[PDB]
Design a protein around this ligand. Structure first.
Ligand code: ADP
Ligand code: ADP
Lengths: 316, 1001, 316
């Protein structure tokens, strides 16, 4: 759990930060901004490492593969670039979206990319060539974010139509349409397997014949609430309230015991779902907080912001 | 006796289905029960909000076999409404031994609640069609259907009407031959004690949430009643038609206070008083039109609060910006003005990327209005009616707040062909989206988007009932029934019957469809609009945006001119200053005087319009968009003029430094020489005026503020007026600026300052009359923010524009032409200029492109025409024109385009007459005149060329006079200009005087 | 430390470049030249960003603030221009201050600026209004460079009278008048605290009762000598010789361990002052070198030159 003393306040961007993530292996952190610069910092020492230009307009999302050797980024110029992170070079570029791309993610299999755009559809690309292979359609408005599950056999996409659709990769069929939010869904996040059983304890959800509790999912919206759904049944297991503005990012603690989230209320909130024990609040930034990320192993948290400053907090 | 002092639950206070049993209520309910059990049609006549509908429903719910169907009467209703109502609910048209009409639900009667029955207009000779129909189908117990001319007899059908006193404006009395069959009951406004007890029960039910303000239940109520009574005896309907205050206002008052107290846990008396005052301001301070009434309302709200709570902290409860929001926090709570401003600025920055990249200034008024509209959108059935001058931001603010609330804004695309069927299809679309496939919708209507009265009556029934009957007929009914069934299964409700699904759909539409009617504050149109559709004045909360106050105009002026270098440390404050801004600091700096003069100019346009209206013809309305264009022109002109003057001074200084270096050279050689001294003397002949200009550079920089202000005000406002009015406006502006000691270079014509001679030559060669007014109009055509509209009796401006943009492949098109769309689309995708004629038949599909409703797509700007969305090219420019000086344009187009009036002047007509008479009478002299005028223009063009090239070459050289090219260039330039001066002087002496003498006769 | 290979040589100016500075936070390199233009470069990738042609005559010196949002520039047009870096436009142009203004600076308070010219005085202006309130006199000739201390309570001025004065901002007195150079002093620079203690063993300076080594200053002149001066005592701590021509700029390495100088000898020299171990010299330019700057965090240095080429070098 991160606490109020931030470790470093890394500021270099000339435009608001959009997404911040951790390299899965190396002790290096990456932040994307609206100035088309993927600046790469070092969170351990609080030192700038090197920027990554190449996009024409604002970068909306960035993601690493399982091995961390590749970094896929999507920008507002309808382009998805791929980066050889060992060489810091753009080895490929992909076009095809009618309007700006606002999400990107690599399949855990490492052989495909998925992206979501304002053209009300989700595209899937192949790593070897860059050619679109599948096109998920069915959203009626801007799709904000797409994030696959752990094994890569399903994806989940939230959109401005105030719905969250869970899709099957194998046959493009819409497995679920979770619609209970009262506003635009801003962000989603899957539930790590380590938390599965704990989930069943918090909501009291009953197990099925196969013994698998059913994959769970989180959805933050501009209705200032974070809902949690069970994909296997398509029902809202619980709702979490307390944010004073639009939720921008939401994620699970690696230990499956807390839910971290950041909103436009300038606060990072750590919530408890099993016992509703902790509701910790952090005055993270002086302006809107756009995204957050929690390191898988090291006890650090990073949060972007509109004040054009990234912050690193230590977990204690 | 039979009036129990019931205690309402702490929840559902002031709910639609609750009423405190009072003497009048139990008496009138008993009377209505007596009359309804006898199945006798009846009528309730009372002022709006007295409690006629609630008493009727209370009487009806006692009868368990009695089901009601609502009906709203406008002033443009026909018996076809009743026929549709019977076809929809009374399907059985069976004819056993006679045609009889009965509802499906057997054993149950039907009450057709007709509201505002006396609105239906009486045609000539004094007859109301629907009233006559009711008299026929009541007295004779049936009617004649038009399908077979057969008599249909009513079964299990009865009528109750709700109306108003005849002396109420907009009301008309019923015929005595009709009043025979319907008894009348008069329901008056609840009396002071009655209101006290009725709402006292509500307040004691509400304050039970916080078990510390219980003791404040009995004062609060009284205070409300006190204040309410004042609003009835001060803002009568005799002043404006919408000044009707009923117990309904006190009901929504208690509901608002209760909702503001629901999630909150603990609250002192100060917070309760603050919430009460905020609600009273949201219920009694918005519909007001003028500021005097607003000041009176604020004074008396604070006065009554202090009177009814002597031991209160006035400052904590009564602050000036009484604001509340649920954006900053998750609970409806007070918010400070500055934090709200910062938050709305950031959210508006996000909104720009979302939609409408058009920037907005955030002054105090905007914040208030966006809070009000958010309040209304948060309500379940929230219908809003914004009355303000066009362009004030009503539509854009509504779209902004709707985006904030997740509503999918849907506006009708009105066009020339738009008819009743098109609007019915639009209503089908919006209702299908709202009811089935549930999604909130901000249906935005404009007072011009309504063409037929059918649109008004459809909107009336949709607003009041929450659902328009008969819109989905035949196949549409079945398809909607299927869609509602699927939506119910998705939601979880299992419904099969038709009426169950219809009621579910109606509830969904009521919950998830908010209508925003934007209308212009037209006098004598308020009463007419109330008569033609009472729902707007009954089921819609009225927000009077009005026109931007001087305070608001001052804020937007400062905010946009926050980049201009208006600071003048030596600005001497005059002994007298004309104060226009109410809160102007009396020792103001230069910026606070410039913005003051800007708002003064905008206020001057209103006086000019009034003067033209009093003695003259049509006047075009002044809107805040004109002020925005004035400020944008002022800023752009300031940057351009400052940049040009600075660059000129830089070139002059570097040239003079090079001349000093040349002087050093020639002097150190003197201490190959004759040419040096000759060029020194010839160049000093110009160095004298160069040094004069360099010295006066500071003076020109000093007076760049007033001159740019006057020029922007001229090219942004006086684009419609004739020469006399333009000169009077400019003279008044100059007099005011001189009063404020604002520096501006006098004795300089506006046309010369705005436009140089270089483009004036092209204009004159492009078939443009050589006069002041035409030059100014061309200037306005050149520098424009909103696309122009040319109002010319003669066609001269048409070929002027055609030749000027001929090189760009400008295309000729008209609104009347059917291919107008295609050509338009072509331009929108190719960026070629477009000139559109016949603007009288304006096509509203142009509304987005005129407002630049572009959408950045990572480098491409995208515009939606009608329903199809097309990429825009940056080279696209569109012009509008007509040949009718005396013609009226639609109000929506008045504020969307700049106006340029190509009138004729006495000077221009004299010039044309002289030129033609010299062409005919003395052709030889006219030929001389023409060849000398063109020759003089060519000399001026060459003079500017050689003079500028001299400076350019002098700047470019970085060496010294030893360069071989520089000496020959400077000698040839001096020779050439001296020779050109020789021709100029000789032709202006010996040949121009003779031409003038010949033309003098 | 800067080494042989120049990373970029950006050449866009039409006139000799006068002074080059770094932006405090953003990766932006700003340059001023004699063509009355202020150019903006990206020293990370050697890219051009924007040119500001608002000034009338040749621009002498430019200076940012601590936050990097405002930029005060001076030119031979007897004006001081306040450039809002946010909008890249003039928000104020303060007039007066007769003759060629030689230097301008923003004190660390960020609310007032100082300006030095040919008119034998130094004027202080408010950022808020631009009205002259204090006007230091006493210099007998052209005043070249002015830079305040790091807390804003003191200023220093070098002049063509070959005297360097240390003035107190608060009460307008001449705290020190160190007049020991053999030729006109062109550049002056204060010392960071991170090197004060170093100075203690560098020159053998003794501590006073307060324990502070005392404020330190530097002055390079046309006498080919660089003097380091103790403001508290007014003594010549140490003089450094070795430049072949007039010294134009002198400053401290961010680590407080080397001294960097750029002179008219067309070379930049990195000297060691504590132990005199390092005397490195690099052929900076084919012509005169006008100014030099060291990035506070990045290992990058930038040199402006008369040949209208701005050269950036890396430190290793
Ligand atoms: N005694 C009362 N009890 C409850 N509400 C009342 C009472 N008297 C007036 N009202 C309120 O007055 C309003 C009357 O609305 P309605 O009956 O539709 O008006 P109209 O008289 O025009 O038919 C409602 O807000 C209602 O709650
Ligand atoms: N407060 C404001 N600040 C800046 N521009 C405004 C403001 N209000 C309106 N506008 C401009 O006016 C236009 C929108 O007018 P609109 O709201 O459709 O008119 P109406 O007031 O008749 O509903 C756009 O050009 C918009 O930028």
């Amino acid at each position: 759990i991160p606490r109020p003393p931030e470790k470093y306040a890394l500021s270099g961007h000339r435009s608001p930060v959009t997404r911040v993530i951790f390299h899965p292996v190396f002790s290096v952190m990456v932040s994307a901004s609206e100035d088309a610069t993927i600046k790469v910092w070092d969170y351990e020492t609080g030192d700038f490492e090197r920027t990554l230009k190449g996009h024409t307009d604002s970068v909306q999302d960035i993601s690493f593969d399982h091995s961390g050797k590749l970094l896929a980024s999507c920008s507002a110029d309808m382009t998805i670039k791929l980066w050889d992170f060992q060489g810091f070079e753009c080895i490929r570029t992909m076009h095809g979206h009618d309007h700006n791309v606002s999400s990107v993610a690599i399949m855990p299999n490492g052989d495909h990319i998925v992206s979501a755009s304002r053209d009300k559809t989700i595209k899937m690309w192949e790593v070897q060539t860059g050619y679109c292979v599948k096109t998920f359609t069915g959203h009626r408005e801007w799709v904000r974010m797409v994030r696959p599950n752990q094994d890569g056999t399903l994806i989940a996409s939230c959109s401005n139509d105030q719905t969250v659709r869970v899709w099957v990769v194998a046959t493009k069929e819409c497995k679920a349409e979770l619609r209970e939010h009262e506003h635009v869904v801003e962000c989603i996040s899957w539930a790590p397997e380590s938390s599965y059983s704990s989930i069943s304890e918090a909501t009291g959800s009953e197990t099925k014949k196969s013994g698998k509790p059913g994959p769970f999912l989180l959805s933050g919206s501009r209705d200032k609430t974070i809902k949690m759904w069970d994909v296997s049944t398509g029902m809202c297991l619980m709702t979490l309230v307390g944010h004073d503005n639009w939720v921008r990012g939401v994620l699970f603690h690696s230990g499956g015991k807390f839910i971290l989230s950041c909103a436009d209320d300038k606060t990072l909130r750590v919530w408890d779902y099993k016992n509703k024990r902790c509701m910790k609040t952090l005055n993270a930034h002086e302006h809107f907080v756009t995204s957050l990320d929690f390191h898988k192993t090291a006890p650090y948290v990073v949060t972007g912001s509109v004040d054009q400053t990234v912050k690193v907090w230590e977990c204690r | 006796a039979k009036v129990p002092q019931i205690e309402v639950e702490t929840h559902k206070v002031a709910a639609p289905d609750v009423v405190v049993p009072t003497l009048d209520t139990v008496r009138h309910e008993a009377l209505l029960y007596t009359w309804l059990a006898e199945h006798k049609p009846l009528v309730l006549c009372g002022p709006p909000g007295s409690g006629k509908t609630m008493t009727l429903f209370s009487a009806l719910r006692a009868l368990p076999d009695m089901e009601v169907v609502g009906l709203n009467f406008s002033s443009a209703t026909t018996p076809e409404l009743l026929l549709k109502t019977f076809d929809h609910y009374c399907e059985y048209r069976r004819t056993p031994n006679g045609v009889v009409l009965a509802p499906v639900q057997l054993g149950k009667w039907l009450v057709l609640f007709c509201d505002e029955i006396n609105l239906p207009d009486m045609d000539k000779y004094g007859t109301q069609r629907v009233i006559s129909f009711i008299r026929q189908m009541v007295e004779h117990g049936g009617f004649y259907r038009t399908s077979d001319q057969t008599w249909v007899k009513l079964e299990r059908i009865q009528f109750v009407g709700a109306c108003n006193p005849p002396t109420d404006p907009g009301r008309k009395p019923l015929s005595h031959r009709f009043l025979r069959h319907v008894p009348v009951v008069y329901v008056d406004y609840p009396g002071p004690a009655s209101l006290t007890q009725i709402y006292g029960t509500f307040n004691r039910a509400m304050l039970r949430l916080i078990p510390s303000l219980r003791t404040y239940a009995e004062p609060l109520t009284a205070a409300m009643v006190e204040f309410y009574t004042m609003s009835q005896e001060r803002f009568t309907q005799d002043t404006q038609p919408h000044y009707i205050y009923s117990p309904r206002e006190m009901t929504r008052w208690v509901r608002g206070i209760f909702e503001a107290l629901r999630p909150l846990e603990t609250l002192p008396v100060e917070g309760l008083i603050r919430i009460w005052a905020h609600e009273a301001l949201r219920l009694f301070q918005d519909r007001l039109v003028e500021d005097e009434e607003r000041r009176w309302t604020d004074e008396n709200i604070d006065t009554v609060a202090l009177k009814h709570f002597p031991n209160i902290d006035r400052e904590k409860a009564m602050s000036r910006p009484i604001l509340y929001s649920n954006w900053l926090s998750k609970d409806y709570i007070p918010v400070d003005q500055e934090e709200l401003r910062d938050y709305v600025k950031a959210r508006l920055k996000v909104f720009y990327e979302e939609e409408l990249d058009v920037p907005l200034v955030l002054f105090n008024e905007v914040l208030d209005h966006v809070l009000r509209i958010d309040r209304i959108f948060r309500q379940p059935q929230g219908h809003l009616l914004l009355i303000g001058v066009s362009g004030a931001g009503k539509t854009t603010l509504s779209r902004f707040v709707a985006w904030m609330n997740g509503l999918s804004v849907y506006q009708i695309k009105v066009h020339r062909k738009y008819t009743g069927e098109d609007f019915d299809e639009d209503l089908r679309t919006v209702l299908r989206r709202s009811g089935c496939k549930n999604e909130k919708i901000a249906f935005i209507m404009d007072e011009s988007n309504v063409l037929d009265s059918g649109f008004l009556e459809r909107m009336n029934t949709l607003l009041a009932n929450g659902e328009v009957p008969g819109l989905f007929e035949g196949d549409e009914y079945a398809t909607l029934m299927t869609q509602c069934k699927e939506g119910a299964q998705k939601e979880g409700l299992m419904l099969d019957s038709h009426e169950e699904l219809y009621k579910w759909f109606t509830s969904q539409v009521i919950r998830n469809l908010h209508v925003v009617f934007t209308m212009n504050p037209s006098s004598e149109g308020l009463k007419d609009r109330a008569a033609t559709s009472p729902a707007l004045f009954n089921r819609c909360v009225l927000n009077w945006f009005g026109d931007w106050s001087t305070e608001a105009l001052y804020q937007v002026g400062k905010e946009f001119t926050s980049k201009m270098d208006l600071e003048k440390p030596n600005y001497i404050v005059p002994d007298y200053m004309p104060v226009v801004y109410d809160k102007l600091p009396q020792p103001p700096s230069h910026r606070e005087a410039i913005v003051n003069s800007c708002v003064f100019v905008h206020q001057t346009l209103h006086q000019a319009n009034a003067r033209l209206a009093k003695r003259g013809g049509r006047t075009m309305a002044i809107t805040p968009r004109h002020y925005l264009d004035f400020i944008n022109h002022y800023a752009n002109l300031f940057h351009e003029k400052r940049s040009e003057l600075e660059e000129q001074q830089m070139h002059l200084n570097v040239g003079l430094r090079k001349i000093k270096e040349t002087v050093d050279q020639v002097e150190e050689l003197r201490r190959k020489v004759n040419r040096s001294t000759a060029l020194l003397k010839s160049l000093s002949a110009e160095r004298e005026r160069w040094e004069k200009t360099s010295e006066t550079f500071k003076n020109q920089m000093s007076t760049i503020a007033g001159d740019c202000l006057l020029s922007a005000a001229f090219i942004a406002y006086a684009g419609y007026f004739d020469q006399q009015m333009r000169q009077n406006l400019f003279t008044t502006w100059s007099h005011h600026l001189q009063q404020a000691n604002i520096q501006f270079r006098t004795d300089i014509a506006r046309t010369e300052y705005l436009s140089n001679a270089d483009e004036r030559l092209r204009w004159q060669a492009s078939s443009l009359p050589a006069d002041d007014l035409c030059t100014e109009n061309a200037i306005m055509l050149k520098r424009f923010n909103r696309y122009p509209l040319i109002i010319d009796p003669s066609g001269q401006a048409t070929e002027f524009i055609m030749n000027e943009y001929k090189d760009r492949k400008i295309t000729r098109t008209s609104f009347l032409d059917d291919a107008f769309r295609k050509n338009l689309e072509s331009a929108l995708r190719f960026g070629n200029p477009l000139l559109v004629q016949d603007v009288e038949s304006y096509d509203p599909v142009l509304n987005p492109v005129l407002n630049r409703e572009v959408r950045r797509t990572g480098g491409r700007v995208l515009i939606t025409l009608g329903d199809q969305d097309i990429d825009l090219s940056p080279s696209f420019v569109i012009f509008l024109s007509t040949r009718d000086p005396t013609v009226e344009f639609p109000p929506d187009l008045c504020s969307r385009v700049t106006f340029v009036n190509f009138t004729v002047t006495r000077s221009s007509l004299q010039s044309q007459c002289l030129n033609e008479v010299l062409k005919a009478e003395r052709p030889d002299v006219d030929e001389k005149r023409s060849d000398l005028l063109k020759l003089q223009g060519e000399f001026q063009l060459r003079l500017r060329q050689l003079e500028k090239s001299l400076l350019q070459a002098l700047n470019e050289v970085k060496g010294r006079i030893l360069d071989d090219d520089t000496i020959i260039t400077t000698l040839e330039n001096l020779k050439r200009e001296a020779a050109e001066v020789t021709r100029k002087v000789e032709e202006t002496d010996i040949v121009m005087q003779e031409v003038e003498t010949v033309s003098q006769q």
